Design a binder for this molecule. Structure first.
Ligand code: DCQ
Ligand code: SF4
Lengths: 95, 427, 160, 166, 117, 353, 180
């Protein structure tokens, strides 16, 4: 149970990352932290409920890898020409 | 047995774009989507299950809606970049996989597989489009994190990751809420709706068409499978409809206002989740798909980049058929008799009242009455004096499509007793 | 067990503190890699062994390497640039962060379960038959997702 | 701590340094081809310890000044000598390096001892490679404290220890 | 399976090795002339500005590394198939075959598009 | 670890220290032997000096490397600069104990190995990635964009071929069916010399093994002769020694791994002596690789990546799918004998035109 | 990368300074900077005897030096109307082309070494040493030989030279074929 509570704490920490971090790339880092804490909880419950959560966590890692590739391509595309990746400077579209 | 054709055509055209011009790639994409649609028809009421992949009425109808939207949005784009269409097939398949399963993890895989090409296809190089894509991307990945923690706590609450499992108390409710967060975010339910206005304003008009039809369709196809409790459902509906319409009042731009209207319509659709009829919701989503596809086809004929409200006025004088279809669509999104949008509205409200949640329904109905302001400010201006406005009078393809959509809306407003039987398992 | 497990958890927690705290992208990435190393250790401790070594192989070896490459190609080391500070967001989100902890803590406390099943070690030997078989369809879906992600990134740059 | 002031250790460490001399060439001119020849397949500086040749200055102790030193090139050599690890020696290869040689004019520094502490000189134009071998032998037996000048003195083992650098 | 104590031994290995490693650094630190000067700290090459200030270096490295993450994911998928192959019979193989095509297409894709980028 | 016993903790730690000092002595003597072999190749001679036979040069070098002003460069990151050599050295030293030098008890009583983890190749794969980690982390840490370029090339190339390693090494696991190397060795004892079956994949492994700093990708890069490589150009006394030491350690590690997997890990068909034949094959690969060190040019890592990407890895995956097809149908193994013999004959006969 | 390919580093033979304006692995534009070896021949020669100047001419291009000494000799001979005996001329072309082969040998050695393989630097240089011995046989110097004179040559070739030159001329073709 200590491991799953630790997963909760790490998920919360990655949430504070995404809320806090100013630059796109560090936000993406926090996103990976969150997803991997989730996979930790999956591993705990996979130990508990019969081993399916392990293959689950593997597929989750693959998904995270794919969306990391695309998200980093995008982060590059926006701020290769542009100034700092900092996301608070993007306010053109307002409600 | 549709997935066979989807995989075949996707993989084939993927490589073929290297040897074949993008125009031929587009022709092949249209043929592939049409053949997938035909396969869906010939499988009407013929469930096919191999793994957790389960073809049922929900998957059938909702994926048919998404296929129609994809066909329509492919019709418009003439890009000399075949990639701008390949993702469509990809995206299409993703949404299909979202509907055809109850498995949370494969549902997540389908979510990402359909959402990534959406993130990419909103890039006309237009500066605001990139901001839109980035905001959408970050919020989508956050929602995937939420849904994944919900799946983890679900696998904790039950030995399987399939919905409908017995379910515990507070832990199962917690998992349900964590799943509902991401799913409603994807379905434009408040207070998880913030992404939709920015995304619809920034994204190119045909892409917004494809999204506002197929994304919401597949999202609700997934949502119906959840055991969504009444209380959270009520709160999401109330806030969604209220915020959507009220803030929609002040909008000066067509596409953004359509985004807020789609948030309010997500609020409306979320009622059937009380009983999860999925037949009445199927019909509701059919009407909405027709209306929104029509309206955004018009918006794409006018301007892919951006359309302000005033630009639409006088649209009747140019083309009468289009003006009539646009006004019919305005009513269908308002839910006014004798149009099928009212049929979907009434169906969702019946499913709600049967569950016995009243005050939320009252608030929803008052807000729908409020919506008449802008539904009219768009419908009625159709006759007003046209100011200077760019108009490119379309091909015959889109004209026939818009006319067919309007005729279908009026018919199913008059004669819904045709399709509604065949929105269950095939009764 | 608990003796070293507590220390491992404290290392994980401190690594998370840094990976969300440190302003230097490189410092952050290294903290994350130490996190994944400890996390693979925990996985192995949790009778799931193959997954921890794939975690070190793929995530450490492949991805956060690429992140390092990007933050070195895109300097970005002093992330705190272009502030638009919104200082109110610093504590507030933390409370929301605290919120998102407590609820989950509330969600999982008083929960004791069957943490004893004969997995016989999470070797890929035993992972195969589930993977190819019952789970083969998810595998094909993942492969298709990867194919789509490749094409997406390619068309995403594709200068003309 | 400088490896000094213990009867056994200083002898041993100086022995080691002497035999492990890692040259960092500062190739300038025609002497440098004979310097390359000091390792060739007929007369190789591949025994005394100077086989390995890290042209980087962060990985070498002995600096072999091989050629004419134009004045624009002087401060470069100044830094490159300064850009060495501190136990460093400067060997002056060729006539042009030690004195002005036949080029006694505005173009060349007339004594390298101006910018860097020169330890050992080796005349010749060019010095036969074996003159470079004898020069590195001079420096070798020097750092052991086994070197005497015509004044008779024991000379300090390391030059670049005797300068108020600045 | 295999005993867990061996994995424990692995950790002990690092504990010793790292320790001697750190010890080496300590030795290297203590035995030194330690004569700090401005020019010794200079980055490189004669006065200032070895590279200087320019625009960002090529993302080609990002391309290679992203490629690598996806294909290493592929390899991590292939190993469980590599171990348990016969017991799954042709059926099992069939999946990975189609699977391979998918990522192979990806590779083939990036081959027919190429990276001069 | 079905069939293999376990030693006490204290003996594990002491074996660790023993392997450390043995790698010190061994890599020092192999630096000597590389000097001498390079010299012997180019008709010039080695150090007939400070020996008698030259075997006192490493001591002089080690004495010089210390006292050599271990420097902390200003304008460089304070902590990472110190930390990186430790990373590169530690993650190079470890992950060599797994390689068995004999049957159990052939260590004068206990055990040839240190640890015999059930998942060997995965552990090796991880530490292979982490060595390059240390390398280019040092490259950045120096704060010289000169060395930055070199560290970038290093990581890119080595990691590309680190990918290709898996698509190569799949096949022998298919045949053996275990991830503990000792099972693979015993497999090579009964059926024999795995490489005979897997020549093509073996090739793309050998070429891949060249990438891990051995020589001729040779855009490692070395500080010498090109845009200076990473992990040096800023290190003076002990850290530079640590870097090159770890590079040599990984060198001999690969030269020992290649025989164990594909060829005949010690386990000789004839005369079956525990250590000596393994050390002889290690020295053979070392001599071949030093032959390469002397004999060939650079690659610029652009054509190198084109080569690995388009040529090596498709070949490795093709062979892997063939082997998996066979094992799934399992009808004979002989079809692989036939196809591998033909593959070697083809990859050779195209030379003699 | 406003990169400073410095003088003599990185191991660029022929010490030269390059300001490579560069992004990535291409080459945008290299701004050359020289002046780091200017010795002042064209000035000092205004203060040296004609005969003396043969002490100066070869030490500029140290690979193909005897071509410099030969060009100087011919220039002055044409200037003051000098006559070269045919033997002097023949030995002149022989030693000059011999230093031509020496130059090409070191050229290929340093080329392959600077980027590429290190081994073939030695064999060529091995042969080069024989060439150098030849010069030491006749001129008493490895290279930079002060042999030619305005009228002709310093002195005759010693008795021991010619067999060594034939030896080298007999072994060289196989050597060159090997390199090719
Ligand atoms: C085994 C390594 C031996 C090389 C030692 C000398 C370093 C290389 C630069 C020296 C050099 C200079 C100055 C030089 O001017 C020159 O001629 C253009 C060379 O070769 C053709 C040189 O090699
Ligand atoms: S002393 Fe002679 S060989 Fe040496 S640099 Fe001067 S001119 Fe050249």
């Amino acid at each position: 149970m200590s491991y799953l509570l630790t997963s909760a704490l790490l998920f919360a920490l990655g949430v504070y990352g995404v809320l806090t971090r100013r630059t796109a790339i560090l936000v993406f880092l926090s996103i990976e932290l969150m997803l991997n804490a989730a996979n930790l909880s999956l591993v705990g419950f996979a130990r508990a409920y019969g081993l399916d959560g392990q293959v689950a966590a593997l597929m989750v890692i693959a998904v995270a890898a794919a969306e990391v590739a695309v998200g980093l391509g995008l982060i590059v595309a926006i701020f290769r020409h542009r100034e700092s990746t900092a996301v608070d400077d993007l306010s053109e579209l307002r409600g | 047995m549709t997935l066979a054709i989807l995989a075949v055509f996707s993989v084939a055209l993927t490589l073929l774009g290297f040897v074949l011009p993008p125009q031929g790639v587009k022709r092949a994409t249209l043929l592939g989507l049409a053949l997938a649609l035909a396969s869906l028809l010939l499988t009407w009421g013929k469930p096919f299950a191999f793994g957790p992949y389960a073809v049922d009425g929900v998957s059938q109808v909702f994926t048919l809606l998404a296929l129609l939207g994809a066909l329509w949005t492919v019709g418009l784009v003439r890009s000399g970049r075949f990639e701008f269409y390949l993702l469509v097939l990809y995206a299409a398949l993703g949404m299909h996989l979202l509907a055809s399963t109850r498995h949370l993890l494969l549902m997540l895989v389908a979510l990402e597989a359909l959402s990534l090409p959406l993130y990419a296809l909103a890039t006309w190089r237009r500066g605001q489009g990139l901001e839109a894509a980035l905001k959408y991307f970050l919020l989508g990945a956050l929602a995937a994190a939420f849904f994944l923690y919900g799946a983890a706590l679900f696998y904790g609450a039950t030995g399987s990751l399939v919905l409908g499992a017995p379910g515990e108390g507070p832990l199962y409710a917690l998992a349900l809420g964590l799943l509902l967060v991401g799913l409603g975010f994807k379905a434009a339910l408040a207070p998880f709706h913030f992404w939709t206005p920015d995304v619809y304003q920034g994204s190119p008009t045909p892409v917004v068409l494809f999204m506002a039809t197929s994304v919401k369709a597949a999202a609700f196809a997934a949502l119906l499978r959840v055991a969504a409790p009444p209380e959270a459902l009520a709160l999401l509906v109330a806030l969604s409809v209220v915020v959507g319409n009220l803030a929609a009042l002040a909008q000066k731009e067509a596409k953004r206002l359509l985004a807020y209207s789609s948030i309010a319509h997500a609020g409306y659709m979320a009622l059937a989740l009380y009983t999860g009829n999925a037949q009445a919701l199927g019909f509701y989503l059919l009407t909405y798909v027709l209306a929104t596809g029509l309206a955004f086809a018009v918006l794409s004929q006018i301007s892919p980049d951006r359309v302000p409200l005033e630009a639409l006025r006088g649209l009747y004088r140019k083309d009468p058929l289009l003006g009539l279809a646009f006004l019919v669509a305005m009513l269908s999104l308002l839910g006014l008799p004798p149009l099928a949008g009212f049929w979907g509205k009434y169906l969702a409200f019946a499913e709600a009242a049967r569950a016995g949640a009243w005050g939320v329904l009252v608030l929803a109905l008052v807000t729908s009455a409020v919506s008449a302001y802008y539904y009219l400010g768009l419908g009625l201006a159709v006759f007003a004096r046209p100011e200077e406005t760019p108009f490119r009078p379309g091909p015959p393809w889109a004209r026939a499509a818009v006319v067919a959509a309007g005729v279908l809306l009026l018919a199913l407003g008059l004669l819904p007793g045709l399709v509604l039987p065949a929105l269950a398992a095939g009764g | 067990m608990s003796l070293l497990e507590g220390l491992a958890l404290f290392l994980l927690l401190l690594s998370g503190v840094l990976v969300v705290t440190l302003r230097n992208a490189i410092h952050a990435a290294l903290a994350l890699i130490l996190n994944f190393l400890v996390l693979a250790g925990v996985y192995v401790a949790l009778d799931a062994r193959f997954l921890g070594f794939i975690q070190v192989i793929v995530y450490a070896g492949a991805i956060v390497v690429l992140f390092l490459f990007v933050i070195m190609l895109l300097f970005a080391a002093q992330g705190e640039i272009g502030f638009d500070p919104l200082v109110r967001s610093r504590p507030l989100a933390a409370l929301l962060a605290l919120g998102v902890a407590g609820i989950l803590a509330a969600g999982l406390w008083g929960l004791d379960l069957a943490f004893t099943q004969d997995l016989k070690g999470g070797l890929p030997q035993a992972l195969g038959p589930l993977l190819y078989g019952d789970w083969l369809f998810v595998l094909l879906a993942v492969g298709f997702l990867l194919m789509a992600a490749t094409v997406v990134a390619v068309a995403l740059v594709e200068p003309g | 701590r400088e490896g000094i002031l213990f009867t056994t250790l200083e002898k041993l460490v100086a022995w080691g340094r002497s035999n492990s001399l890692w040259p960092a060439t500062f190739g300038l001119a025609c002497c440098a081809i004979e310097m390359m020849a000091s390792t060739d397949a007929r007369n190789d500086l591949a025994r005394f310890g100077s086989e390995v040749f890290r042209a980087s200055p962060r990985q070498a102790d002995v600096m072999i000044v091989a050629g004419r030193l134009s004045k624009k090139m002087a401060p470069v050599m100044r830094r490159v000598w300064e850009q060495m690890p501190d136990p460093k020696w400067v060997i002056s290869m060729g006539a042009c390096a030690s004195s002005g040689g036949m080029f006694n004019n505005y173009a060349i520094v007339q004594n390298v001892d101006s910018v860097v502490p020169v330890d050992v000189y080796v005349p010749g134009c060019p010095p036969r490679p074996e003159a470079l071998i004898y020069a590195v032998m001079q420096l070798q037996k020097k750092v052991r404290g086994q070197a005497y000048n015509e004044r008779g003195e024991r000379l300090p083992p390391v030059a670049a220890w005797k300068r108020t650098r600045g | 399976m295999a005993p867990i104590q061996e994995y424990v031994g692995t950790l002990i290995y690092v504990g010793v090795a790292l320790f001697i490693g750190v010890a080496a650094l300590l030795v290297g630190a203590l035995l030194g002339p330690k004569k700090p000067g401005r020019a010794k700290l200079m980055p490189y090459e004669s006065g200032n500005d070895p590279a200087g200030e320019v625009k960002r270096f090529p993302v080609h490295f990002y391309v290679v590394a992203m490629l690598f993450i996806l294909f290493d994911v592929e390899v991590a998928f292939l190993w469980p198939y590599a171990v348990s192959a016969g017991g799954l019979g042709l059926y099992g193989f069939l999946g990975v075959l189609a699977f391979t095509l998918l990522l192979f297409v990806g590779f083939l894709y990036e081959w027919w598009k190429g990276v001069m980028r | 670890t079905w069939s293999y016993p376990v030693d006490p903790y204290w003996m594990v730690a002491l074996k660790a220290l023993l392997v450390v000092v043995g790698l010190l002595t061994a890599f020092a003597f192999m630096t000597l032997i590389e000097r001498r072999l390079l010299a012997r190749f180019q008709v010039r001679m080695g150090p007939n000096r400070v020996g008698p036979f030259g075997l006192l040069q490493p001591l002089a070098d080690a004495i010089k490397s210390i006292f050599k002003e271990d420097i902390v460069v200003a304008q460089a990151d304070r902590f990472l600069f110190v930390l990186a050599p430790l990373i590169s050295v530690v993650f190079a030293l470890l992950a060599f104990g797994l390689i068995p030098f004999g049957p159990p008890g052939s260590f004068f009583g206990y055990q040839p190995w240190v640890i015999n983890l059930d998942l060997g190749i995965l552990y090796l794969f991880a530490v292979s990635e982490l060595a390059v980690y240390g390398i280019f982390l040092s490259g950045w840490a120096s704060g010289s964009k000169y060395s930055l370029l070199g560290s970038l090339r290093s990581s890119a190339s080595l990691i590309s071929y680190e990918l290709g390693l898996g698509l190569a090494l799949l096949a022998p696991v298919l045949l053996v069916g275990s991830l503990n190397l000792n099972d693979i060795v015993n497999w090579q004892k009964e059926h024999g010399w795995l490489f005979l079956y897997a020549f093509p994949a073996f090739l793309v492994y050998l070429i891949a093994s060249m990438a891990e700093a051995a020589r001729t990708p040779f855009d490692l890069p070395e500080a010498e002769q090109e845009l200076v490589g990473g992990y040096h150009t800023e290190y003076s006394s002990i850290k530079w020694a640590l870097f090159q030491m770890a590079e040599y350690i990984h060198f001999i590690t690969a030269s020992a791994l290649i025989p164990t997997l594909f060829l005949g890990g010690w386990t000789m068909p004839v005369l079956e002596v525990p250590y000596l034949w393994m050390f002889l094959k290690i020295a053979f690969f070392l001599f071949f690789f030093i032959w390469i060190r002397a004999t060939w040019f650079r690659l610029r890592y652009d054509q190198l990546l084109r080569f690995g990407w388009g040529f090596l890895f498709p070949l490795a995956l093709l062979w892997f799918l063939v082997t998996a097809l066979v094992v799934a149908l399992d009808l004979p193994r002989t079809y692989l004998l036939y196809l591998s013999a033909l593959s070697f004959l083809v990859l050779l006969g195209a030379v003699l035109y | 990368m406003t990169l400073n390919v410095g003088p003599q580093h990185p191991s660029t033979h022929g010490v030269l300074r390059l300001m490579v304006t560069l992004s990535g692995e291409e080459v945008l534009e290299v701004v050359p900077h020289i002046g780091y070896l200017h010795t002042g021949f064209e000035k000092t020669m205004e203060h040296r005897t004609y005969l003396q100047n043969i002490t100066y001419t070869p030490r500029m291009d140290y690979l193909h030096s005897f071509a410099h000494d030969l060009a100087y000799a011919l220039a002055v001979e044409k200037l003051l109307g000098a006559v070269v005996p045919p033997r002097a001329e023949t030995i002149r072309v022989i030693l000059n082309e011999l230093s031509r082969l020496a130059s090409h040998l070191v050229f290929l050695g340093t080329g392959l070494l600077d980027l590429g393989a290190l081994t073939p630097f030695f064999y060529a240089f091995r042969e080069r040493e024989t060439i150098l011995d030849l010069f030491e046989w006749v001129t008493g110097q490895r290279f930079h030989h002060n042999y030619i004179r305005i009228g002709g040559v310093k002195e005759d070739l010693p008795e021991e030279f010619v067999p060594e030159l034939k030896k080298l001329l007999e072994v060289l073709p196989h050597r060159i074929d090997e390199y090719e």
